[PDB]
Amino acid sequence: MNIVPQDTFKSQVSTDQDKSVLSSAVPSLPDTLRQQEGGAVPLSTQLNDRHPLESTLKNWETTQRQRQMEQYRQIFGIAEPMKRTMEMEIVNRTDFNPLSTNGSIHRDILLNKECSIDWEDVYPGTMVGDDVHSKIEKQLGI
Amino acid sequence: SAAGYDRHITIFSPEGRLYQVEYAFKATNQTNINSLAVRGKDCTVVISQKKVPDKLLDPTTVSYIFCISRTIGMVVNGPIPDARNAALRAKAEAAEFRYKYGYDMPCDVLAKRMANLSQIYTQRAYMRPLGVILTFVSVDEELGPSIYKTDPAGYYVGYKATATGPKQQEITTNLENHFKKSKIDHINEESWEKVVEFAITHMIDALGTEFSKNDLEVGVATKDKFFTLSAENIEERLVAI
Amino acid sequence: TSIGTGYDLSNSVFSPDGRNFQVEYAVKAVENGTTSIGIKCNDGVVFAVEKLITSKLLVPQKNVKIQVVDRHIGCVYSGLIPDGRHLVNRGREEAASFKKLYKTPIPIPAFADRLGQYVQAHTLYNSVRPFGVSTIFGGVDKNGAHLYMLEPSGSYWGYKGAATGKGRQSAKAELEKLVDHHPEGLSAREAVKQAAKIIYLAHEDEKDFELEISWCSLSETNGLHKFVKGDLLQEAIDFAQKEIN
Amino acid sequence: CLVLPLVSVGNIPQLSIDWLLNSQANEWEYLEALDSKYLVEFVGPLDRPEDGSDSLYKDADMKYSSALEVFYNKKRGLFAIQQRTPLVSVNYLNNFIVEIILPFLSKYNISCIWDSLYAMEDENGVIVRPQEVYSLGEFMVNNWLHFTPTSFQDKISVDQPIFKILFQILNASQRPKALRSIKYCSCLANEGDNSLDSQQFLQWIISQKVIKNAPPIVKFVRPISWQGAYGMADARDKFVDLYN
Amino acid sequence: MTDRYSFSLTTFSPSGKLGQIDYALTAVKQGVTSLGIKATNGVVIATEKKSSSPLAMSETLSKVSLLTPDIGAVYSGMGPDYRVLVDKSRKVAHTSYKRIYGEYPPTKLLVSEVAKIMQEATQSGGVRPFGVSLLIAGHDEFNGFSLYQVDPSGSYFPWKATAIGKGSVAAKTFLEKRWNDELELEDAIHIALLTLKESVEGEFNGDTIELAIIGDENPDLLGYTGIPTDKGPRFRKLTSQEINDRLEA
Amino acid sequence: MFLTRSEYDRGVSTFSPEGRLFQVEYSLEAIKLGSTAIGIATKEGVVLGVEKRATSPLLESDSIEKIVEIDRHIGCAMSGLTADARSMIEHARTAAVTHNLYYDEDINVESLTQSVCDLALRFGEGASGEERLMSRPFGVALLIAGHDADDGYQLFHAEPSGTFYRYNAKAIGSGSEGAQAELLNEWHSSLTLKEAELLVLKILKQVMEEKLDENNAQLSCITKQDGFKIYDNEKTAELIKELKEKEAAE
Amino acid sequence: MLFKQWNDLPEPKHLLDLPEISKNLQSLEVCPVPKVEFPDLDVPQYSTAVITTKIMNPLFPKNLLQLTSIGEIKTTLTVVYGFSFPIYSFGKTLLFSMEENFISISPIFGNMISRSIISQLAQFSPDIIVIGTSDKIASMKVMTENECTLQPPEFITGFIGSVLTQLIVGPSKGLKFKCLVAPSEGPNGFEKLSLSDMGSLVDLCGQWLGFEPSRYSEECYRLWRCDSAAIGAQSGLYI
Amino acid sequence: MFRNNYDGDTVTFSPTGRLFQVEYALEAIKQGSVTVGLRSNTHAVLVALKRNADELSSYQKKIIKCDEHMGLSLAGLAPDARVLSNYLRQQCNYSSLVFNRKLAVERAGHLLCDKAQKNTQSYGGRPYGVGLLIIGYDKSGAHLLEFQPSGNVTELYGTAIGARSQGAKTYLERTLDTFIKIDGNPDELIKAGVEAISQSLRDESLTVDNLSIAIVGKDTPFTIYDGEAVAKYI
Fold first, then answer.
1. Is residue H71 within 8 Å of H222, Cβ to Cβ?
2. Hey, is C148 helix, strand or coil?
3. What are the sequence ranges of the domains in chain E?
4. How far is CA D221 from CA A109, E187, F5, in A?
5. Which residue in the set G3, G6, G7 is minimally distant from E3, CB to CB?
6. Residues on chain G touching F6 (C-beta within 8 angstroms)
7. Where are the domains of chain F?
8. Closest partner CB to B12 (pick from E52, E54, E131)
9. CATH architecture for the domain at F9-250
10. Which residues of C are catalytic?
11. CA–CA gap between residue H131 and residue H84 (Å, rounded)
């Protein structure tokens, strides 16, 4: 029953915390070239000096969804949140469009956002990566 | 029947049809009961048939009429598990609409929402449609008395009056003849009791052989509340002509 | 036709007649289980189970065939043992959560609806299997005594008397006779005697058997679910043996 | 008339033969064992009707059953073939028609063929009427058979074995003269437990009077082997940790 | 894991054809007839209403939908897919164009967005293609009036006049013999009524056919006065009384 | 009573009617397709020996690596699919180095073998309850030879099923049957290191199609003081010549 | 696992995935049949013949018996297929060992080889013992020409099925035989056995071959556990 | 034949209402060697017969220690035995760490049943194929439990599982009143267990290599005897 998102800070760090981009030469260290972030961005710099509202905005919709699921569990039972989560997971897992980033129509219907617009909708948004094969590897887990 | 696929999932056949949707449609007549919905001047009446062949059953626990919100009632044709699933989802939809937009959910908007969910089920491969037919009745603050029906294919539409069941054709023909005679798309009565009696009379003359107070279920929607009648109320309505 | 070829290899598939054959196969699995009955009296419920005798190595007090979902809710089931255990655990979780949230024992219809929704959700996807159990549960709440039966399809109903398992036909016939012979109602002790009689009569299959009975009545157990002590169980067994021979 | 079932989808023809040989066990007796060079070899016990009637094997010193057997019904004068295993390869199908079936037909001066089709594998569009279930024919793609208007097909694909059987029978340089007509009964079905499907197929074949001498069947009887179709006959009671 | 993917529901047949798209086209061809006629002063879009029973209120369900005040659409095929795609198009008109440029999109760009949405359903692992065909009529400042047809595969083409549905071939021939570069909006409406008269088996009156026009701006439909530069909607749906009056004449 | 087709041997998570997993059996069959590896454990060290199957004479002699060093006190021999053995060897090396990092000691040979077997279990549920990592069982078998202070010199056999055994002598690969029979006949607890080397060479020569020489066979040993070493071609050739002279003496 | 693939519909199981003799499936002619040539040998010199498959090799230890090769049965098919079928002898007993392989070898070769062997052996009526496996039986079976212990729907197929068919309904009816059948699982040429079934096979084979129990059982046990094909993953998978 | 069509996975019922993959998993227990468990009011013991790959190999471990007051013995698959033993160890450790409490044997059985039932109703995995015998001593005394991988747990005074375990079970049934009263004498109970497991031997003799014993009790922490430690009980 949370309104404002809570527990947004990291509690542990490591040099292999990002499994997607790890060096093949030294598997315990991240791959700076394939990160494509400017090459001078250590992970430690991401732990300080953030805008206070950024974490609230990034996790807002997930928090509202979790509160709705908790209310359904309290009032309806386990089956209702189970079914909602199953529907959403099936819809999300069957969609794979490497050339587009827009959400599906059915996802919007399930989220009850058929006729709703937020700034995420208006503003949806290299040398290495950003290709179809990287998305294939990330999606399949290989 | 389906040759290869189309026996499990909802994809097109060579004829351009969705066999799983049609089979879900055929699944709606398993209960072999009928329901009727009519509009009054300021009320909407739904009457459903009760069949309790088993003598060990508790009759008071058998019902296909559900209360969705303060103003909306629903009648389901089909097996009771999918009926209860649909009822719970409709309750959640109405409550969320009220929370999100600041006013009560209208009957037609809820019908459209359920139909959109049904469209999801008809297009996704790993989802099956619910083999039920839903009928929502209310007295909308803008549109007056309202009856809207939704089916497994995702199609929804509003009705002056409607009937659904294995014997829906006879009731539909009788209603059409009556509305031809009266030239009015509703019932000209000032109380919902007269409308209930008229619906009971229509059901009796359409199905035949009549019934007692325990073979019927009646729900009535007014401008303020939707409520289901009890056995004594139905007995009074049967006695009163 | 009982066997639908081409439409019985997946859970969430409609047949051309609008039937779900995996649920019906689960029903057939239920119909082979041990006989269980439930009877609703004027102020409570009685449950009876035809237990099959086993090796002497079993600890006598650690193998009970009637499960207590909560202090006012008791249930029995026929079908697959793991499915029954899973459903009993889910029912206990639901009752505990309801009592924590609303500071009162859960009403029987609310419990029945939650259990039925959980069962029905397992007929929706091809990655799960319908439950192979049918459950007879009941108890007492502020509105009185309630007895329900729940099927693998998620369909549940309230009953005056319910029977499941191999000997379901004879048990149902005896329950119908009992209901007909008592239009006014029934008492808890008469219900226990008749439950013993019905369990004894329904048995028809060289194998010795024992009987378990359970009460939940306002006047007898203060609205709580209890087992049967030696005296009442012995009296009911004597009545049943007189009925048989 | 000789009834030749084919090893097809669901083993429906073979199962139907079982019905025909157990529901009317009085009229049927074991006659002969054919050569099984082109089949997968088979040895097993003697099957008997479930209801307790006498075995179709009247000989007392025979205790084994082979892959390919021929039964005879003198009251109706009908020959039936029961085949336990499929052909070693489709390539030898021709041989099976030429060196086995035709010599038997010539030897006994016999004056139908039972089959099933799977709709998902219809790559030539021979199913023109999916509404109906059965097809009856009498005598790329071929049009040598005359199917009834109520059949689901009007032609046969060249990939089907029935076309090869027809070609071998018609083009045989020394085919028996006593052979007059060919009948072909086929059904559309799906794999699974096809006992009731086979019963309905046999009922349709008998009702249509495809074979004149075939009498109607009222009480259907299974053999005793079908009791082991799901494994041990009393296996469910063994698993006390699962069923209760 | 074997659930991190799902195989494609639309694949190439050996002849080089996508079977699901062809079956969706068949489903479209089994639908009710709809048509569009493009004139010098406007575009007419028309269709035949259908009802499961006479007791249904045909005005509750409308096959003609306003996408923007200057763009409307009609259909042939399956209704729920229509409803889903219309809602999506109405949302996309705002998210992609009006929240960026302050103005509604031209007809062609909205058609392109709808067609992209439809195409993404033919390269998926868990949705079938939309079994529906679209007619979109519109007007914009730098392109004038336009009429487009969108197919289930996501291909769209501009037409001077066209029809889709069960009676599409005969309607196409009748429109071929009755179109010219100097037609007017009223002439187009009359031709559309005549063409629909050849396809409706039952009652051809104002309660069984549905028409809408893209014509001149209607300041009486704005809902407010005071701004001379605010143009009214050009999309207008004809009432049943107007259709009856035109049929009588 | 008809002959149909059974399909219980195609999925790793499907039981046969008698409760068997046939994909594991077929993985063992894949193991038997590889070359032969023999290990003999004595009181003076453990000897490992492999046969190099060179399909073409153009293949580099020092390219087939059937014997690897997991750690200074632990060596391994492999038979089966080399691609899977590569991953298994990488995991074993990582485990040994991590144990040294966190405990400042050598890891027990049995602990390393158990870790490798826990990795091999990954086609199903993991030992600690982890989700499935791969789609099929490995097609390799390992012989792990080591020495530690707790248990002396040990030789373990690790299989794709996730189970390992302790052996006095063990042969895997194509010619494993005759080699294992010879090991059963010719092993005793009082063997020396040189006798073990000669026995390994003799059994390899017996079970090898080609004439045994320094280029199609490889020897290695692990001892407490010198650690794990792989003999060069000159030492193995000298051993082969001594074996030939001993055979020709009779 | 959220779902299972929609397109994983099982193939109908009335078809056995057996090797194809010829690539041309549209042929209208008669496919050629393999020719079998049987060896020089003195059949009367041996009073007993044993017919079985390779999976039963541990039942016949080499050193304990006097197993010596005498010749090879030659089977040739041209459409070109060639095979060799070595024959062994110990004491006065013959041994025909068949190498089944459901991937590489068609059953037609087994049928023809069984026909040739039975035709050659029927001219002298020796003692015939058949040892084989079946996937359709519940427990071990001992059968003769007078009694069949199989209950329906159990049956025997494969090369041993071919041999029994030739001995029962072939052109050489009446030859007495003893058949020992053990339960197994797996495709032909890749079967597996239980340890108890292996022990029962060893005991009954020793009793029928007239050898001392202890030494024969020891040798057979050692051969069974020496990475035999029938004990593939038993030790490592079950504890 | 008809069973062949409906035994693909654990989410399929046959038309007669049978779940064949679970039955096959239950049948997988017979491929393992025999283990016996028994107990009295004071002590609980397990006896196991171990098997080796061949003469040159070691013997398999059949008894695994979970906690100072609880242990188990296996019959069936090796991977599932490893998984379930590790899971029970984790649960005991969690109980001790969070509550300073000894995990009850009944609680462990319930947790095992809950974990086992899941794999028999969802697609993508397989049911477990190992039977377990769990002995322990807690605040309610001595406990013996039999876990069947269908997801079932039974509480008994004595039992046996594995290949040819029927003879040992019959012997335990016949002499229940004798060993049920052996209180304060661990040796007598262990010898009774050895005699019980001797009924299941076929052409085999118990040696110091193939016999493993485990005991737990009021003052006895769970202890495993192997090798010469069992020579006195032969």
1. yes
2. strand
3. 1-249
4. 56, 77, 26
5. G3
6. 13, 135
7. 9-250
8. E131
9. 4-Layer Sandwich (3.60)
10. 34
11. 10
C-alpha separations of E120 from A131, B128, E112, G5, G38 in Å: 18, 22, 12, 20, 68
DSSP state of D212: T
Note the residue count of chain B. 241
CA–CA gap between residue C181 and residue C159 (Å, rounded) = 17
Peptide bond into G153 cis (omega under 30): yes
3-state helix, strand, coil in chain C (%, to 5): 40, 25, 30
Closest CA to F39 of F3, F92, F79: F79
Which residue in chain C is spatially nearest to D200 when comparing CA positions? Answer: C1
Which residue from B30, B80, B126 is facing C125, i.e. has the nearest CB? B126
The DSSP bridge partners found for residue G83 are: G75
Which of H178, H203, H162, H191 is CA-nearest to residue H36? H162
Whether residue H33 contacts residue H63, with contact meaning beta carbons closer than 8 Å, is answered with no
Q: Judge contact between H149 and H80, C-beta under 8 A.
A: yes
| Residue H170 structure tokens | 């019959």
Q: Give the three-class secondary structure for E137.
A: strand
- Residues from chain H contacting residue F14 (CB–CB below 8 Å): 8-9, 21, 126
Residues 6+ apart with CB under 8 A from E169: none
Is D232 near chain G, with CB under 8 Å? Answer: yes
| Ramachandran angles phi, psi of B69, nearest 5° | -145, -165
Q: CB-based contact (8 Å) between E15 and chain H?
A: no
CA distance, residue B126 to nearest chain D CA (Å): 21
CA distance H167 to H199: 5
Domain ranges, ordered by start, for chain H: 4-234
| Residue G16 in contact with partner chain F when CB distance is under 8 A | yes
Q: Name the helix (H) or strand (E) containing E172.
A: helix E168-176
Surface-to-core class of residue G177, CB atoms within 10 Å of its CB (0-12 exposed, 13-18 middle, 19+ buried): middle
* Strand H43-49 relative to strand D68-73, pairing: unpaired
Angle at G211 between CA G208 and CA G212, to 5 degrees: 130
Experimentally determined by: cryo-EM
Q: Domain G35-237's class?
A: alpha beta
Backbone torsions φ then ψ of E210, nearest 5 degrees? -135, 125
In sequence order, the β-bridge partners of residue B44 are B39, B221
Residues of B whose CB is below 8 A from G3: 126
- C-beta separation of H45 from H37 below 8 A: yes
Read off the amino acid at residue D7: V
Chain C residue with the nearest C-alpha to that of G4: C127
Length of chain A: 142
> What domains sit in chain B, N to C, each tagged with a CATH number?
4-241 (3.60.20.10)
Q: Are C208 and C53 in contact (CB under 8 A)?
A: yes
Domain H4-234 sits in CATH at 3.60.20.10
CATH code reported for the domain at E1-249: 3.60.20.10
Q: Which two tokens stand for residue B67?
A: 């209360």
Cβ separation E84–A117 shorter than 8 A: no
The number of angstroms, rounded, from the C-alpha of F65 to the middle of its chain's C-alpha atoms is 12
Contact B43, B221 (CB under 8 A): yes
What is the C-alpha separation between H215 and H69, in angstroms, rounded?
10
Q: Following CA atoms B90, B93, B99, B104 in sequence, which dihedral angle do they give, to the nearest 10 degrees?
A: -60
| Angle ∠(F40,F41,F43) on CA atoms, nearest 5 | 140
Alpha-carbon distance G188 to nearest alpha carbon in chain D (angstroms) = 12
8 A C-beta contact, residue C33 and residue C152? no
Work out the angle at residue E79's Cα, subtended by the Cα atoms of residues E75 and E84, and round it to the nearest 5 degrees. Answer: 95
* A80 → closest Cβ in B88, B93, B117: B88
How many C/D residue pairs have CB atoms within 8 Å? 40
Looking at chain G, which runs of residues are DSSP E strands? 35-37, 48-53, 68-77, 81-90, 93-98, 127-134, 141-144, 156-157, 177-183
- DSSP summary character for residue D39: B
Structure tokens at B106: 């209208």
The residues facing H65 across adjacent strands are H71
Residue of C nearest to D240 (CA): C81
